[PDB]
Scaffold this active site. Structure first.
Site, PDB file in Angstrom:
ATOM      1  N   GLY A  15       0.796  -1.172   0.000  1.00  0.00           N
ATOM      2  CA  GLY A  15       0.000   0.000   0.000  1.00  0.00           C
ATOM      3  C   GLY A  15       0.845   1.244   0.000  1.00  0.00           C
ATOM      4  O   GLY A  15       1.131   1.836  -1.025  1.00  0.00           O
ATOM      5  N   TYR A  17       3.790   3.276   2.948  1.00  0.00           N
ATOM      6  CA  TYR A  17       4.462   3.181   4.235  1.00  0.00           C
ATOM      7  C   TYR A  17       4.660   1.740   4.578  1.00  0.00           C
ATOM      8  O   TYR A  17       5.198   1.417   5.594  1.00  0.00           O
ATOM      9  CB  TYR A  17       3.679   3.804   5.369  1.00  0.00           C
ATOM     10  CG  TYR A  17       3.582   5.273   5.185  1.00  0.00           C
ATOM     11  CD1 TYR A  17       4.693   6.066   5.305  1.00  0.00           C
ATOM     12  CD2 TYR A  17       2.392   5.871   4.849  1.00  0.00           C
ATOM     13  CE1 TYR A  17       4.614   7.420   5.122  1.00  0.00           C
ATOM     14  CE2 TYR A  17       2.311   7.218   4.663  1.00  0.00           C
ATOM     15  CZ  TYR A  17       3.429   7.980   4.786  1.00  0.00           C
ATOM     16  OH  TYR A  17       3.356   9.319   4.606  1.00  0.00           O
ATOM     17  N   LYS A  35      -0.344  -5.172   8.263  1.00  0.00           N
ATOM     18  CA  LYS A  35      -0.008  -3.964   7.530  1.00  0.00           C
ATOM     19  C   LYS A  35       1.166  -3.293   8.248  1.00  0.00           C
ATOM     20  O   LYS A  35       1.032  -2.834   9.390  1.00  0.00           O
ATOM     21  CB  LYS A  35      -1.235  -3.051   7.468  1.00  0.00           C
ATOM     22  CG  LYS A  35      -1.131  -1.844   6.564  1.00  0.00           C
ATOM     23  CD  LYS A  35      -2.534  -1.361   6.230  1.00  0.00           C
ATOM     24  CE  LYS A  35      -2.550   0.020   5.610  1.00  0.00           C
ATOM     25  NZ  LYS A  35      -3.960   0.407   5.283  1.00  0.00           N
ATOM     26  N   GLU A  80      -8.151  -8.612  10.768  1.00  0.00           N
ATOM     27  CA  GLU A  80      -8.743  -9.869  10.314  1.00  0.00           C
ATOM     28  C   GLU A  80      -8.399 -10.102   8.831  1.00  0.00           C
ATOM     29  O   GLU A  80      -8.442  -9.177   8.022  1.00  0.00           O
ATOM     30  CB  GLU A  80     -10.272  -9.860  10.489  1.00  0.00           C
ATOM     31  CG  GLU A  80     -10.982  -8.777   9.665  1.00  0.00           C
ATOM     32  CD  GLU A  80     -12.502  -8.861   9.707  1.00  0.00           C
ATOM     33  OE1 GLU A  80     -13.068  -9.966   9.615  1.00  0.00           O
ATOM     34  OE2 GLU A  80     -13.138  -7.797   9.829  1.00  0.00           O
ATOM     35  N   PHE A  81      -8.049 -11.338   8.478  1.00  0.00           N
ATOM     36  CA  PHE A  81      -7.760 -11.657   7.091  1.00  0.00           C
ATOM     37  C   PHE A  81      -9.041 -11.850   6.293  1.00  0.00           C
ATOM     38  O   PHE A  81      -9.927 -12.584   6.707  1.00  0.00           O
ATOM     39  CB  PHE A  81      -6.902 -12.915   6.993  1.00  0.00           C
ATOM     40  CG  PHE A  81      -6.611 -13.348   5.576  1.00  0.00           C
ATOM     41  CD1 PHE A  81      -5.687 -12.653   4.796  1.00  0.00           C
ATOM     42  CD2 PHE A  81      -7.258 -14.453   5.027  1.00  0.00           C
ATOM     43  CE1 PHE A  81      -5.402 -13.058   3.476  1.00  0.00           C
ATOM     44  CE2 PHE A  81      -6.980 -14.876   3.710  1.00  0.00           C
ATOM     45  CZ  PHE A  81      -6.055 -14.168   2.931  1.00  0.00           C
ATOM     46  N   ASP A 126     -12.603   7.015   0.231  1.00  0.00           N
ATOM     47  CA  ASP A 126     -11.932   6.259  -0.838  1.00  0.00           C
ATOM     48  C   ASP A 126     -12.614   4.938  -1.189  1.00  0.00           C
ATOM     49  O   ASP A 126     -11.950   3.918  -1.429  1.00  0.00           O
ATOM     50  CB  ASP A 126     -10.440   6.042  -0.556  1.00  0.00           C
ATOM     51  CG  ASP A 126      -9.637   5.866  -1.842  1.00  0.00           C
ATOM     52  OD1 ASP A 126     -10.053   6.425  -2.879  1.00  0.00           O
ATOM     53  OD2 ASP A 126      -8.608   5.175  -1.829  1.00  0.00           O
ATOM     54  N   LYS A 128     -13.929   2.220  -3.295  1.00  0.00           N
ATOM     55  CA  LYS A 128     -13.698   1.681  -4.611  1.00  0.00           C
ATOM     56  C   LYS A 128     -13.511   0.175  -4.424  1.00  0.00           C
ATOM     57  O   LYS A 128     -13.197  -0.266  -3.315  1.00  0.00           O
ATOM     58  CB  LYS A 128     -12.463   2.338  -5.262  1.00  0.00           C
ATOM     59  CG  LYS A 128     -11.185   2.209  -4.462  1.00  0.00           C
ATOM     60  CD  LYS A 128     -10.021   2.738  -5.259  1.00  0.00           C
ATOM     61  CE  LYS A 128      -8.744   2.720  -4.450  1.00  0.00           C
ATOM     62  NZ  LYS A 128      -7.631   3.338  -5.229  1.00  0.00           N
ATOM     63  N   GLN A 130     -11.297  -2.043  -5.075  1.00  0.00           N
ATOM     64  CA  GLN A 130     -10.011  -2.446  -4.494  1.00  0.00           C
ATOM     65  C   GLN A 130      -9.967  -2.346  -2.941  1.00  0.00           C
ATOM     66  O   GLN A 130      -9.211  -3.074  -2.289  1.00  0.00           O
ATOM     67  CB  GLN A 130      -8.863  -1.633  -5.116  1.00  0.00           C
ATOM     68  CG  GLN A 130      -8.660  -1.802  -6.658  1.00  0.00           C
ATOM     69  CD  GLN A 130      -9.518  -0.843  -7.552  1.00  0.00           C
ATOM     70  OE1 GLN A 130     -10.499  -0.244  -7.120  1.00  0.00           O
ATOM     71  NE2 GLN A 130      -9.121  -0.723  -8.810  1.00  0.00           N
TER      72      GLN A 130
HETATM   73  N1  LIG Z   1      -7.505  -7.456   6.154  1.00  0.00           N
HETATM   74  C1  LIG Z   1      -7.030  -7.785   4.928  1.00  0.00           C
HETATM   75  N2  LIG Z   1      -7.156  -9.033   4.428  1.00  0.00           N
HETATM   76  C2  LIG Z   1      -6.670  -9.360   3.210  1.00  0.00           C
HETATM   77  N3  LIG Z   1      -6.043  -8.494   2.387  1.00  0.00           N
HETATM   78  C3  LIG Z   1      -5.850  -7.203   2.759  1.00  0.00           C
HETATM   79  C4  LIG Z   1      -6.341  -6.776   4.083  1.00  0.00           C
HETATM   80  N4  LIG Z   1      -6.023  -5.481   4.211  1.00  0.00           N
HETATM   81  C5  LIG Z   1      -5.384  -5.105   3.076  1.00  0.00           C
HETATM   82  N5  LIG Z   1      -5.266  -6.130   2.207  1.00  0.00           N
HETATM   83  C6  LIG Z   1      -4.646  -6.059   0.851  1.00  0.00           C
HETATM   84  O1  LIG Z   1      -3.643  -5.034   0.745  1.00  0.00           O
HETATM   85  C7  LIG Z   1      -4.078  -3.993  -0.152  1.00  0.00           C
HETATM   86  C8  LIG Z   1      -3.565  -2.613   0.273  1.00  0.00           C
HETATM   87  O2  LIG Z   1      -3.933  -2.274   1.618  1.00  0.00           O
HETATM   88  P1  LIG Z   1      -4.864  -0.992   1.987  1.00  0.00           P
HETATM   89  O3  LIG Z   1      -5.806  -0.705   0.834  1.00  0.00           O
HETATM   90  O4  LIG Z   1      -5.447  -1.244   3.360  1.00  0.00           O
HETATM   91  O5  LIG Z   1      -3.809   0.236   2.151  1.00  0.00           O
HETATM   92  P2  LIG Z   1      -3.361   1.268   0.982  1.00  0.00           P
HETATM   93  O6  LIG Z   1      -2.048   1.875   1.410  1.00  0.00           O
HETATM   94  O7  LIG Z   1      -4.471   2.226   0.649  1.00  0.00           O
HETATM   95  O8  LIG Z   1      -3.144   0.323  -0.313  1.00  0.00           O
HETATM   96  P3  LIG Z   1      -3.034   0.898  -1.821  1.00  0.00           P
HETATM   97  O9  LIG Z   1      -1.979   1.978  -1.736  1.00  0.00           O
HETATM   98  O10 LIG Z   1      -2.632  -0.309  -2.638  1.00  0.00           O
HETATM   99  O11 LIG Z   1      -4.419   1.409  -2.140  1.00  0.00           O
HETATM  100  C9  LIG Z   1      -5.599  -4.133  -0.201  1.00  0.00           C
HETATM  101  O12 LIG Z   1      -6.238  -3.578  -1.365  1.00  0.00           O
HETATM  102  C10 LIG Z   1      -5.775  -5.642  -0.086  1.00  0.00           C
HETATM  103  O13 LIG Z   1      -5.651  -6.312  -1.346  1.00  0.00           O
HETATM  104 MG   LIG Z   2      -6.235   0.600  -0.803  1.00  0.00          MG
END
Ligand SMILES: Nc1ncnc2c1ncn2[C@@H]1O[C@H](COP(=O)(O)OP(=O)(O)OP(=O)(O)O)[C@@H](O)[C@H]1O
Ligand SMILES: [Mg+2]
Ligand SMILES: [Mg+2]
EC number: 2.7.11.22
Lengths: 296, 257
Positions: A15, A17, A35, A80-81, A126, A128, A130
Site C-alpha cells: 500500500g 508506508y 499492515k 482480520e484476514f 476512498d 472503490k 479495491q
Molecule cells: N484485512 C485484509 N485481508 C486481506 N487483504 C488485505 C487486508 N487489508 C489489506 N489487504 C490487501 O492489501 C491492499 C492494500 O492495503 P490498503 O488498501 O489497506 O492500504 P493502501 O495503502 O491504501 O493500499 P493501496 O496503496 O494499494 O491502495 C488491499 O487492497 C488488499 O488487497
Molecule cells: Mg487501498
C-alpha cells in the site's frame, strides 16, 4: 500481542508506508493481515487517522483492526484476514458475471457498513472495489481507512483531494467548500453500477473528463436539478449542456427497483442524494439474502 | 440532517469514556493548575501563529489532560507533552498540519526534534491511539444549528467562552464538554440577544437551565474576571475580526438564575 507469535505466509499487497502480509497466529491458529507502517515527520497522519478511527468502528461490515504492535522504528496493524478484494472478484467473473443475489447482498452490506461509519461521524472518502474486501462466507467489508476522517456537524472545509477519480462525486469535482456523507454514497452508486457491468461507470482520465463523462450520462445539471450549481467555484458557463439520457440505458440489466436505487445514489444535489441509512429500506432489498461467493 | 441525532448520541457516550480524571492534579507531585493554565495559554498562541482550527486546540488539551491523568511529569517536561499533543491534534484535524520542525521552533529549542518525536510516540501509546475525542467545540457547532436566526456574534462569543474554560482545570475539569458547550451557548445567547437556552435544545440534549446552572455560575464568573486573569491569549485572539471582536463585548452583571 507481539510479532513473535505470528508466522508470515505471503505478501498480499503493498500500500504505502509498507507492505501488507498474510500471517498466522502460531498459538490460536487465527489468520490475519499484517499492515507494516515504516517510521522523519514521525507517525504519518494517515496512520494516526486510520488507527484512531478503526478502533471506534466495530461492525461486521468494517474490516476489524485486531491489534497495533507498536515498536521502535516499526508499526504493525493486525487486521482480520479477508481472502479477496471486490476488484479481483469482478475480474474473475469476467464472462458469466456476478449473480444478482450476490450483487444485492454486497450492496446491502456495504450500505450497512457505510451507515455505521456516518452514524459515528466518519467519512471514508476512498470507496472503490479495491478497498472492499470479501470472505468465503459471503461477507463484504469496508477497508482502507487511510483517507478517512472524523467529521463535525455541520461539516467545515476538508481536504479537496479525496476519492479516487473514477468514484469522485461531482461536488468535489466542482470545488464546493463543503462536502459531506453524500460523497461516499456517490462512490457506492458507481460501485453498484460496476458490479452489474464489471466496468467502471465513469472512467475519466482528468477532473474535467470525469465531469463531462458524468454530464453525458446524467445530463448537465442546471439550477433546477441542483440549486447553486452554476455558482460553484469550478463551474464554467461554457460547459456543454448534455441531455439526460433514459436512465434504463445507464445500466441496462437493472430492473425497475435497481434503477430507482441507483438513480437516488447518483442524484446531483448532495442534499437530495439518498443516505446509506434510507437506502437499506429500498424495495430493491425486499428479497435480499447472504449467499457465499459463487467462486473460490 | 440524517445522522445528526445518531452522532450527538454517539458523542455523548464518547465524552464519558474520554473524560480525564477530575482529581489528577492533586496526584501530580511537580505540576499545578497554574502551570497547566500557562501551557494551555501558550497552545492558544501557537494555534494563532499557525492559524490552526479551534478544534485542534480543544483536541490537544484533551490529550494533555488524559496523558497527565496516568503519567507523572516534571515541570521542565510539561511543555514537551503539550507540544507533542498539539502535533498529534494537528495531524488528526488539520488539512495542512505544521511540520515537526515548526513545532521544535516554537518551543524556543528547549527540546530537540528527537525528543518531540519520541514524546509523540509515548503519547500515542498512553492514549492507546484513541484520538477521536469529543470537545466543547463539537457540541457547540451542533447547538449553533438551533439559533433563530443564526448570529455570528453568538457563535464567536460561545467559542470564546468554551475556550476560556480550557485554561482553568479548577473548576472546568469536572464538567463534560456537552455541558460546558451548553453553558457557553446560553451565556453567549443571553449576552448578545437576551434570549436563552432554547427548548429545542432541551429536547435534543435533555439539559435545562437548572441542570446547566452550576457550570453556568462558574462560566459567568470566569467571563466577568477574564480581563484580570493571568492568562490573556484567548481574549487577545478573540479581538480579531475573524471572531467578530467578541472579547470586546461586555459581560452581563446578572443572569437571573
Ligand atoms: N484485512 C485484509 N485481508 C486481506 N487483504 C488485505 C487486508 N487489508 C489489506 N489487504 C490487501 O492489501 C491492499 C492494500 O492495503 P490498503 O488498501 O489497506 O492500504 P493502501 O495503502 O491504501 O493500499 P493501496 O496503496 O494499494 O491502495 C488491499 O487492497 C488488499 O488487497
Ligand atoms: Mg487501498
Ligand atoms: Mg500538584
Amino acid at each position: 500481542g507481539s510479532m513473535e507469535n505470528f508466522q508470515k505466509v505471503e505478501k498480499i499487497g503493498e500500500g504505502t508506508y509498507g507492505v501488507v502480509y498474510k500471517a498466522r497466529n502460531k498459538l490460536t491458529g487465527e489468520v490475519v493481515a499484517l499492515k507494516k507502517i515504516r517510521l522523519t515527520e514521525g507517525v504519518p497522519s494517515t496512520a494516526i487517522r486510520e488507527i484512531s478511527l478503526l478502533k471506534e468502528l466495530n461492525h461486521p461490515n468494517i474490516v476489524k483492526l485486531l491489534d497495533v504492535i507498536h515498536t521502535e522504528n516499526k508499526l504493525y496493524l493486525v487486521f482480520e484476514f479477508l481472502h479477496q478484494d471486490l476488484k479481483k472478484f469482478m475480474d474473475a467473473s469476467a464472462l458469466t458475471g456476478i449473480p444478482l443475489p450476490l450483487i444485492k447482498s454486497y450492496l446491502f452490506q456495504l450500505l450497512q457498513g457505510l451507515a455505521f461509519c456516518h452514524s459515528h461521524r466518519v467519512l471514508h472518502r476512498d470507496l472503490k472495489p479495491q478497498n472492499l474486501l470479501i470472505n468465503t462466507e459471503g461477507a463484504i467489508k469496508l477497508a482502507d481507512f487511510g483517507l478517512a476522517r472524523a467529521f463535525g456537524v455541520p461539516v467545515r472545509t476538508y481536504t479537496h483531494e479525496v476519492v479516487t477519480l473514477w468514484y469522485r462525486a461531482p461536488e468535489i469535482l466542482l470545488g464546493c467548500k463543503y462536502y459531506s456523507t453524500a460523497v461516499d454514497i456517490w462512490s457506492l452508486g458507481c460501485i453498484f453500477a460496476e458490479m452489474v457491468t464489471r466496468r467502471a461507470l465513469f472512467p475519466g482520465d482528468s477532473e474535467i473528463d470525469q465531469l463531462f463523462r458524468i454530464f453525458r450520462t446524467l445530463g448537465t445539471p442546471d439550477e433546477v436539478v441542483w440549486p447553486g450549481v452554476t455558482s460553484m467555484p469550478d463551474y464554467k458557463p461554457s460547459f456543454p449542456k448534455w441531455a439526460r439520457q433514459d436512465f434504463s440505458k445507464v445500466v441496462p440489466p437493472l430492473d425497475e427497483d435497481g434503477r430507482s436505487l441507483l438513480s437516488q445514489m447518483l442524484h446531483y444535489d448532495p442534499n437530495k442524494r439518498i443516505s446509506a441509512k434510507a437506502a437499506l429500506a429500498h424495495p430493491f432489498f425486499q428479497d435480499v439474502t447472504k449467499p457465499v461467493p459463487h467462486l473460490r | 440532517p440524517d445522522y445528526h441525532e445518531d452522532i450527538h448520541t454517539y458523542l455523548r457516550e464518547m465524552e464519558v469514556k474520554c473524560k480525564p480524571k477530575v482529581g489528577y492534579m492533586k496526584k501530580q507531585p511537580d505540576i499545578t493548575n497554574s502551570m497547566r493554565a500557562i501551557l494551555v495559554d501558550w497552545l492558544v498562541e501557537v494555534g494563532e501563529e499557525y492559524k490552526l482550527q479551534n478544534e485542534t486546540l480543544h483536541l490537544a488539551v484533551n490529550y494533555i489532560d488524559r496523558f497527565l491523568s496516568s503519567m507523572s511529569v516534571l515541570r521542565g517536561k510539561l511543555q514537551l507533552v503539550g507540544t507533542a499533543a498539539m502535533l498529534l491534534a494537528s495531524k488528526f484535524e488539520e488539512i495542512y498540519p505544521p511540520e515537526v520542525a515548526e513545532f521544535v521552533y516554537i518551543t524556543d529549542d528547549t527540546y530537540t526534534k528527537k525528543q518531540v518525536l519520541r514524546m509523540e510516540h509515548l503519547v500515542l501509546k498512553v492514549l492507546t491511539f484513541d484520538l477521536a475525542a469529543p470537545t466543547v467545540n463539537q457540541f457547540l457547532t451542533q447547538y449553533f444549528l438551533h439559533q433563530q436566526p443564526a448570529n455570528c456574534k453568538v457563535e464567536s462569543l460561545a467559542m470564546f467562552l468554551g475556550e476560556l474554560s480550557l485554561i482553568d482545570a479548577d473548576p472546568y475539569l469536572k464538567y463534560l464538554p456537552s455541558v460546558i458547550a451548553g453553558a457557553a451557548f446560553h451565556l453567549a445567547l443571553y449576552t448578545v440577544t437576551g434570549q436563552s437556552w432554547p427548548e429545542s435544545l432541551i429536547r435534543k440534549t435533555g439539559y435545562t437551565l437548572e441542570s446547566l446552572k452550576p457550570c453556568l455560575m462558574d462560566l459567568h464568573q470566569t467571563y466577568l474576571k477574564a480581563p484580570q486573569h493571568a492568562q490573556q491569549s484567548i481574549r487577545e485572539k478573540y479581538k480579531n475580526s475573524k471572531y467578530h471582536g467578541v472579547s470586546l463585548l461586555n459581560p452581563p452583571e446578572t443572569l437571573n438564575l
